[PDB]
Amino acid sequence: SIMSYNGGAVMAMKGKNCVAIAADRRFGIQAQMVTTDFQKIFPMGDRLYIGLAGLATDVQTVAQRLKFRLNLYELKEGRQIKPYTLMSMVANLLYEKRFGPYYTEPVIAGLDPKTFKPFICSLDLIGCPMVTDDFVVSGTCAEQMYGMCESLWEPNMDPDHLFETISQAMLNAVDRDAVSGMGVIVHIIEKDKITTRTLKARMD
Amino acid sequence: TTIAGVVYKDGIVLGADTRATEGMVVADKNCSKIHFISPNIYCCGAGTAADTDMTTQLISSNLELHSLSTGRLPRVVTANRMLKQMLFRYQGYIGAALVLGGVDVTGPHLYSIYPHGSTDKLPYVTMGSGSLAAMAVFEDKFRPDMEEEEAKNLVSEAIAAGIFNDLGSGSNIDLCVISKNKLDFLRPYTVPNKKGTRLGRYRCEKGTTAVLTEKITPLEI
Amino acid sequence: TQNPMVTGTSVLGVKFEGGVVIAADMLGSYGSLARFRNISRIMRVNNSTMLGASGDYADFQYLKQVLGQMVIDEELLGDGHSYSPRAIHSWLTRAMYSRRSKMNPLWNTMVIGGYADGESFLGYVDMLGVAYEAPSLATGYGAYLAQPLLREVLEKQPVLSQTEARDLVERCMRVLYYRDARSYNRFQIATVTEKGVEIEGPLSTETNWDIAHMIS
Amino acid sequence: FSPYVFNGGTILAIAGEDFAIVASDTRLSEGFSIHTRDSPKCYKLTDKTVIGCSGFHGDCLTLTKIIEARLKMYKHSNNKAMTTGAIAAMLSTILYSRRFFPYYVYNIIGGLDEEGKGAVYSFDPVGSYQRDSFKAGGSASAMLQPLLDNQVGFKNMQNVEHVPLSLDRAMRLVKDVFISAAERDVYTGDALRICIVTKEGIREETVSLRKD
Amino acid sequence: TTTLAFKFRHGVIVAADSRATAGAYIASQTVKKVIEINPYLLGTMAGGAADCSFWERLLARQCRIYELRNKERISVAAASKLLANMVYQYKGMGLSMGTMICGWDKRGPGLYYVDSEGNRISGATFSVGSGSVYAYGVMDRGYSYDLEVEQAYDLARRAIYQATYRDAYSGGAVNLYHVREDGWIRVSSDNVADLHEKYS
Amino acid sequence: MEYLIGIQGPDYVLVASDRVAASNIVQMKDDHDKMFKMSEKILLLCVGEAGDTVQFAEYIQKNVQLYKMRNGYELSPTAAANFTRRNLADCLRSRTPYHVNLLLAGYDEHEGPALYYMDYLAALAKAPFAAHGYGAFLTLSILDRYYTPTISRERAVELLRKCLEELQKRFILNLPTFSVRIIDKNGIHDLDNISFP
Amino acid sequence: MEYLIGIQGPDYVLVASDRVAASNIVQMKDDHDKMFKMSEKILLLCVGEAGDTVQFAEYIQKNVQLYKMRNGYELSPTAAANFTRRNLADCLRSRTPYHVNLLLAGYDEHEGPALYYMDYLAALAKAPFAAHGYGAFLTLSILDRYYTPTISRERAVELLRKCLEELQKRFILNLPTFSVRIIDKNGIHDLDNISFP
Amino acid sequence: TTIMAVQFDGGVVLGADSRTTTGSYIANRVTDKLTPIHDRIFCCRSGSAADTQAVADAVTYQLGFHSIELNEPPLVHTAASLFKEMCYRYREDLMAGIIIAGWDPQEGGQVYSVPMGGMMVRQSFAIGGSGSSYIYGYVDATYREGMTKEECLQFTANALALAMERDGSSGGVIRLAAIAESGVERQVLLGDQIPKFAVATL
Amino acid sequence: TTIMAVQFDGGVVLGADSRTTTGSYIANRVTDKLTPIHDRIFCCRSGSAADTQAVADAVTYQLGFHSIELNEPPLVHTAASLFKEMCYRYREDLMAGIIIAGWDPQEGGQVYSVPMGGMMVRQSFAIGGSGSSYIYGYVDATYREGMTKEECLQFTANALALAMERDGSSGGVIRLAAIAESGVERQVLLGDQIPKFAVATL
Numbered sequence A: 001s002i003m004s005y006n007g008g009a010v011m012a013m014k015g016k017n018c019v020a021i022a023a024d025r026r027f028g029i030q031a032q033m034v035t036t037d038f039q040k041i042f043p044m045g046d047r048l049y050i051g052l053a054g055l056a057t058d059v060q061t062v063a064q065r066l067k068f069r070l071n072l073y074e075l076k077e078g079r080q081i082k083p084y085t086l087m088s089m090v091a092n093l094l095y096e097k098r099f100g101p102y103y104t105e106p107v108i109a110g111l112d113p114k115t116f117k118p119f120i121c122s123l124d125l126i127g128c129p130m131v132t133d134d135f136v137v138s139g140t141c142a143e144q145m146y147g148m149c150e151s152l153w154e155p156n157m158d159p160d161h162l163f164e165t166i167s168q169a170m171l172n173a174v175d176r177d178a179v180s181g182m183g184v185i186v187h188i189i190e191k192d193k194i195t196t197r198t199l200k201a202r203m204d
Numbered sequence B: 001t002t003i004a005g006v007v008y009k010d011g012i013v014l015g016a017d018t019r020a021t022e023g024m025v026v027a028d029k030n031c032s033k034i035h036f037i038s039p040n041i042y043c044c045g046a047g048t049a050a051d052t053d054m055t056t057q058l059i060s061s062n063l064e065l066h067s068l069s070t071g072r073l074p075r076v077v078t079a080n081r082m083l084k085q086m087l088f089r090y091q092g093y094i095g096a097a098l099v100l101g102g103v104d105v106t107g108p109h110l111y112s113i114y115p116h117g118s119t120d121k122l123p124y125v126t127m128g129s130g131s132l133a134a135m136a137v138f139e140d141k142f143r144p145d146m147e148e149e150e151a152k153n154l155v156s157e158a159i160a161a162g163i164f165n166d167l168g169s170g171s172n173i174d175l176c177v178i179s180k181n182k183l184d185f186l187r188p189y190t191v192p193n194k195k196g197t198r199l200g201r202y203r204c205e206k207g208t209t210a211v212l213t214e215k216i217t218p219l220e221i
Numbered sequence C: 001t002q003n004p005m006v007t008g009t010s011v012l013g014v015k016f017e018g019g020v021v022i023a024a025d026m027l028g029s030y031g032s033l034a035r036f037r038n039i040s041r042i043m044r045v046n047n048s049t050m051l052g053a054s055g056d057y058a059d060f061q062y063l064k065q066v067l068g069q070m071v072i073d074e075e076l077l078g079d080g081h082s083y084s085p086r087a088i089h090s091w092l093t094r095a096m097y098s099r100r101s102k103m104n105p106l107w108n109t110m111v112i113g114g115y116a117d118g119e120s121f122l123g124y125v126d127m128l129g130v131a132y133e134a135p136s137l138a139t140g141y142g143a144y145l146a147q148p149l150l151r152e153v154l155e156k157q158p159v160l161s162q163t164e165a166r167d168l169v170e171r172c173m174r175v176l177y178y179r180d181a182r183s184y185n186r187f188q189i190a191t192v193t194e195k196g197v198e199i200e201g202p203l204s205t206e207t208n209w210d211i212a213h214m215i216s
Numbered sequence D: 001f002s003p004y005v006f007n008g009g010t011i012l013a014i015a016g017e018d019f020a021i022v023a024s025d026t027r028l029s030e031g032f033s034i035h036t037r038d039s040p041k042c043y044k045l046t047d048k049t050v051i052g053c054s055g056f057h058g059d060c061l062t063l064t065k066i067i068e069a070r071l072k073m074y075k076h077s078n079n080k081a082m083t084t085g086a087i088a089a090m091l092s093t094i095l096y097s098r099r100f101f102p103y104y105v106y107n108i109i110g111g112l113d114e115e116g117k118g119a120v121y122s123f124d125p126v127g128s129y130q131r132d133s134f135k136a137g138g139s140a141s142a143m144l145q146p147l148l149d150n151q152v153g154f155k156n157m158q159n160v161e162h163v164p165l166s167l168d169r170a171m172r173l174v175k176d177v178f179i180s181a182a183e184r185d186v187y188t189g190d191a192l193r194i195c196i197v198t199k200e201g202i203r204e205e206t207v208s209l210r211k212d
Numbered sequence E: 001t002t003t004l005a006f007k008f009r010h011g012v013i014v015a016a017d018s019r020a021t022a023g024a025y026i027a028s029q030t031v032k033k034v035i036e037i038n039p040y041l042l043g044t045m046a047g048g049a050a051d052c053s054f055w056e057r058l059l060a061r062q063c064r065i066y067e068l069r070n071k072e073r074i075s076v077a078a079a080s081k082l083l084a085n086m087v088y089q090y091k092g093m094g095l096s097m098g099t100m101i102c103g104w105d106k107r108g109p110g111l112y113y114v115d116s117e118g119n120r121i122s123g124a125t126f127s128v129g130s131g132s133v134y135a136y137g138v139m140d141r142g143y144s145y146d147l148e149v150e151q152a153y154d155l156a157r158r159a160i161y162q163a164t165y166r167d168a169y170s171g172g173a174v175n176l177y178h179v180r181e182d183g184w185i186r187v188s189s190d191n192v193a194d195l196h197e198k199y200s
Numbered sequence F, G: 001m002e003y004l005i006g007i008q009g010p011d012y013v014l015v016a017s018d019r020v021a022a023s024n025i026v027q028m029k030d031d032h033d034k035m036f037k038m039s040e041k042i043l044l045l046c047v048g049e050a051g052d053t054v055q056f057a058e059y060i061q062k063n064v065q066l067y068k069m070r071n072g073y074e075l076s077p078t079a080a081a082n083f084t085r086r087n088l089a090d091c092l093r094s095r096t097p098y099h100v101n102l103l104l105a106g107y108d109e110h111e112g113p114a115l116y117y118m119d120y121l122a123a124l125a126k127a128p129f130a131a132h133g134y135g136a137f138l139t140l141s142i143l144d145r146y147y148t149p150t151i152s153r154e155r156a157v158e159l160l161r162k163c164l165e166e167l168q169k170r171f172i173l174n175l176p177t178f179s180v181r182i183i184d185k186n187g188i189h190d191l192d193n194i195s196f197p
Numbered sequence H, I: 001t002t003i004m005a006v007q008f009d010g011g012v013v014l015g016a017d018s019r020t021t022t023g024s025y026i027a028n029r030v031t032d033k034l035t036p037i038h039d040r041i042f043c044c045r046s047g048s049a050a051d052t053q054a055v056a057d058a059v060t061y062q063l064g065f066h067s068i069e070l071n072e073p074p075l076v077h078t079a080a081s082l083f084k085e086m087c088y089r090y091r092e093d094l095m096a097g098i099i100i101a102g103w104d105p106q107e108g109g110q111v112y113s114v115p116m117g118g119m120m121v122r123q124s125f126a127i128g129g130s131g132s133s134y135i136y137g138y139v140d141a142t143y144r145e146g147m148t149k150e151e152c153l154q155f156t157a158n159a160l161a162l163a164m165e166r167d168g169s170s171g172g173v174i175r176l177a178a179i180a181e182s183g184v185e186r187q188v189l190l191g192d193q194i195p196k197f198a199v200a201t202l
């Protein structure tokens, strides 16, 4: 599989007036680790983030082209983009390459720039959007993340409990995948602050 | 995927399931497979999700343009022609299988459109991996010129047959009733499956997770 | 065999209070050609057991030879022990698995039906050695078209009468004639009860073609 | 001609101080169709041992028969019943005997050791086996295993007391984990069969899972 | 998989990881890659788990039979020769075995590398598996015949730790064994998380 | 297979490459240079397929020098690395892909020393140390064992010698001599070649 | 790839082999012996596929020594070579072929020194000098240039040094040390290893 | 698929089965394989459903435009020529066997066959499809010159029923059309209207 | 190849073509595909010439031995069983489609079909070969119960001629055999004895 060449895991979770997005930190060529500080979560706004999983070259390419398009949109419109609009923009970008696909799967997590309502969505290889009220996962350890998230997620969680839930899910899921891990980074997005945390993880 | 459609005395009933899978894992449990084309025309999609989505959006935009130009209510044959010409152009590489239902000045029309550009105009149609299970119910219980409630029960039964007997179909049942006087978009219509109650609380408590670094950024309102 | 040559389509089976009913059409197809139109794909094994097969008719005939000889051999002993439907089902499973393990399969899917000790038996064996028991069974395309209707009836009403079961079998056969390309309009119905095995011969389904006028 | 097919199914085993639990789903499927909704994947070997088999069903049936025969033969030759570890080693040799035309079976053995404690042994299709404290196998093994690592093994948990596992908590955990598995895996559903092994014997329970 | 062994003045040092993988799924993190053939003779496992286990258990049976018939313990060279002859009969059929046989006999310490391809080589330092390349560098930069026992322990732990850091298919814990003249001892089982704490 | 290595220090970058050009089983050249000078404080080290290496490297060199001529100042290492990744990635899906593995070393007056790793799929990583080739597998753990972020350039040359000695002991290929350069605030300095008789 | 060489003189045979045992990209052993002692005046040098080499070589060794035990005298080099070729050829068309390339060196009291070349297809040739491996391609012309039939063993060791030096200059593989033996009327003598620091 | 056309003095008779298959599953069981190309010109389509539909629509468009520009009823030969051009040009891409039947004032009733590959031949009767193989001897034995419209209808129905009995890809109902100067008459034969032939029994 | 057998009250009629092909070249143009297995038992061979010849010789040997040991005329069912056993056992190795026709005192005139794969079925009439496909509708339309020997001969000749017209692998002369209690009568139809059917002309 060409998706599993570099590995990687991204997860987004929904709370009460908050969102959380977590990712693994490994960059490696198949079985060899190259670095342990690879960026997979990019800011597309003050309370809007996108996480990309898959082939690292396509991750960087898609992030840069998406920032191109988003910057032009925000200059022309004089507004900040809504999360659903960004979902549509990403889907359009991915489907333009339908027969020469980018090998990346995105998750979007954010708060609406006016009503501050949580939003999370996922997109597959070619751009079918999936909007959920609980959680979304993407990467090489998707089944493991699905099991953890189905077992742990509860509705209407405050930011601290949301952090604990997503941290436990990501840690225990990547501990069972060989090409994912080497650290976890979590962003908790609220109305008034962004909190970034790095987790104590297994480095084997 | 199980999608179905029947013609009854006053119009069209379309039905679908709400499960989306990536291989043998369930990705989405509340997908909407009934798409809007025009206020009188709707489409049920099966196959490749992105292809179905983009194709239906493109044809819907084209039909809105046509209706603005003409000032008249769009016709189901126009949608049929647009869709099948587009799909024939791509030689089956756009993996969209569609059930197209509408009511126009000529009456209720129902079509089945296949990914290679083949079209069939029929009084009842099924598509998807659970199509044969739905078609068994249709071939057993279909009568011409049914009432609205009979047709709704029949389409619900066919979608349920797809749900319980196919591994790629599941979750809830969505319905769309189209007559000349009204439109009913019933999401959800029946819920046959639910998740069992949880018996344990997996200790969720603060300070269980160990942190190395932390950065807090204040945002201005 | 590695390539089947003359095949049969789908076999149906339902258990009811006091016995089992099995149905199959009388056609052997050479590809898409309806070549042999008067063949019987149901077999009476013994007074309690009957068998129906889909797939290679030559492999079915070989199995009929071997099973008949086994039954005769047991009846020569005269000791008051007979083969139950369950024992014949287990022997069939062993035979198919042994053939598969030698990479020389018997290209059949089999339904075994029986009535012994006041209990009904319905069993499935496949080419690979997958075998199981269920209250209704259907092979081939009937697995997609007939099993839904049978299952829906059985979930609501778990116990059926002979009349209800026969009516349900006739409905399912009609559906198969509507939607299977390798199907034929003549079928046979075998029933096993406390009286034994009865086979009812060339039966036809009444079809409806009114929708032909709705094409416009 | 392919000699194999995938028939689905998930099995789970949890070892306790004085108990063992072996659970499985009861759905038998092939491709996108369902064969039966009432095919359990757990088999009783002795009064102290239960086995769980998932994979290709013909191989499962044949292997079950072979194991039963070998247990009878051992009792004839040695005048005693076989222990859980002896059964595990014998099964390892049985699996390796087909190394060049394997059994497509995943096996988990659960029971009591000779001191009365819980024992779980996990196998791969060619006969490599290990003694564990919990193990999941089948189609939803990758979903079930991380949750058991967290909740039974207390991995990644900071300042959490390692209270010993009780039969009640284990039963609740099994039920919850199978409820979560039936949500996301298409091969898992129908009913859950739970077998509890204690010095009083083997006790069975069945609970319902969603039928779609 | 990372397995390692070296001879020094005070005996043989054997070290292994504990991760078992099936594709990219981590099947286990507590697997045992060292087989105890007899109280004076050890073997390591890399490649196919079932193959290595079965054939080294068969070697253990044959070595016990040798001791019964000849009333003397088998030598390391003879045991490695037996294993190589056993696995040569199945060449081209798909066996995956990489083994180190370690012990102490009348010639002193012994260490032999035997693989399913047919190699049987004697040596003073060996490493087998996916992470063997990473272990070789640390071991080669640290190895001396005149090491002290604690220094040898630390070197083996460090090499396995670095291999688990760089290789995706290595991890878990470091299991360490010391072959001495009176038999082998189990030294330690150290989780690589604790080693990360110690070394960083 | 060809070998590249780079070590980053507090105020310097140290790079080394092998000097072998091979065809089939013979070494055609033993004093080959695999380092390209992008600017006064940037070096590009390229290995990979024949022809692809020089064509890609010289295209990048020409465009970087054109930036200097047109704007009167030089590209920073980060900008040069991102330009390189953009071009390699763009050509990845075309009919003329380049099969090149690259290291980029540089010094910025405001950002300091920088070392960048790029594989043939055009993924860009920033590293304290990095290596390319089959010998990387043998020498990356030596760097992991002995590297500290506060390392002096004398100790860096010693660590480089350790890695090359390991290649002489355990590697099956004959890589007898290595080119060594250093980049600091004063520019690019050629150090002595590391040779093994 | 492994390297074997043999030079025949008026009263002696000189053989050399490399001492490297390799797996993938690492040298696992650097003091490997590839010479097998058939009798008091016969040496067999075998390279090729792993396992095949030792199995075939030790089978031949066992049968030659059994001839000595049974008959009270030893096989001549010619007879040993023909026995070896017969066995390799017989196994060529069976289900268990050996992929081995061989040199056989010997001294006969009545026939003198002898060197025999055998490829994996079991063709047997008698030669004044011969070599096996990829390095043969590089060193056979050096032997052609400087070999005379009347060469002394001091000059033979010098010519061997020339060939090995060429391998150090032009060959892509790391073959740093070589085992050297000589066979004369007094038997087999181990000479010093030829090493390149 | 089984398609047939027979010419009588003053017109033509066309007939087809009504089965669409995706493998061994019948997707449509009442399909119409007879297409009006013009007022007195019809085509029977065999092969790929999509390909035949597309070609038929294109020829209908071109023929309508031609008839408007010339202010005449079209000729059957012209429609056959348009079909031949399209089927020969895209013969690598298309799987389409066509029968073109019709009436025009100049030549009367005409039947043309365009097989796969794009050749065009005029026949007195034409048969096509996968089931056509089973009725070649029957049509050769039964065809006679100077048949009337009713005899042609009976002959076509008999042949189609015989083909539907033996072919797994043919079946359903029989669709018939008679084209003459007075116009087009269409019939469906279903159930007991379909001719029956006794099956041999021992 | 086209082979046929029809049963009448008191016997059977067999018929075959006379073409052997190696690709598109006719190696033998007067071959005999009807083989006497016993005095009143014949086989029609289809498929591989060598395979069918070998199987026929083996069955002739076995049946002769059986008849000598039992001191009875053999049954047609016994010959069909021997053919079925051999064709099923070596079904992977053999390409042989057989028709076995005959008369015995116990059951009268009998026709059995052994297709490829080794199944055995008794039929009132049987057709086989590559040309048999073109006459399925004709035999279904023309077959009637209670035919006489002369009507059966005419029916078989008509069917074989129709098959030979349309198949490139069938042709030559028509070989017919009638088997009854009184014995075997063999005929050849060549040239103008072969039934003619008019070809459509425009």
Ligand SMILES: *C(=O)[C@]1([C@@H](O)[C@@H]2C=CCCC2)NC(=O)[C@@H]2CCO[C@@]21C
Pocket: B001, B002, B019, B020, B021, B031, B033, B045, B046, B047, B048, B049, B052, B128, B129, B168, B169
């Ligand atoms: C249904 O066909 C299905 C769904 O993904 C469906 C597709 C179109 C609309 C959105 C969701 N398509 C698939 O590929 C899987 C396989 C079986 O059914 C699916 C769930």
Ligand SMILES: *C(=O)[C@]1([C@@H](O)[C@@H]2C=CCCC2)NC(=O)[C@@H]2CCO[C@@]21C
Pocket: E001, E002, E019, E020, E021, E022, E031, E032, E033, E045, E046, E047, E048, E049, E052, E129, E130, E169, E170
């Ligand atoms: C190691 O080589 C490895 C181990 O799973 C295996 C299992 C335990 C005992 C023997 C070693 N074998 C494998 O196939 C995977 C991939 C590479 O390393 C493994 C983890």
Ligand SMILES: *C(=O)[C@]1([C@@H](O)[C@@H]2C=CCCC2)NC(=O)[C@@H]2CCO[C@@]21C
Pocket: H001, H002, H019, H020, H021, H031, H033, H045, H046, H047, H048, H049, H052, H129, H130, H169, H170
């Ligand atoms: C007929 O040839 C057939 C029809 O599906 C098709 C239906 C619409 C009009 C054109 C003919 N084509 C096919 O591919 C199937 C298989 C054999 O015959 C079909 C039923």
Ligand SMILES: *C(=O)[C@]1([C@@H](O)[C@@H]2C=CCCC2)NC(=O)[C@@H]2CCO[C@@]21C
Pocket: I001, I002, I019, I020, I021, I031, I033, I045, I046, I047, I048, I049, I052, I129, I130, I169, I170
């Ligand atoms: C007939 O099936 C055929 C005959 O050659 C063969 C001749 C002898 C008696 C058995 C039948 N077999 C063939 O392979 C060719 C090709 C098609 O028909 C043949 C003429």
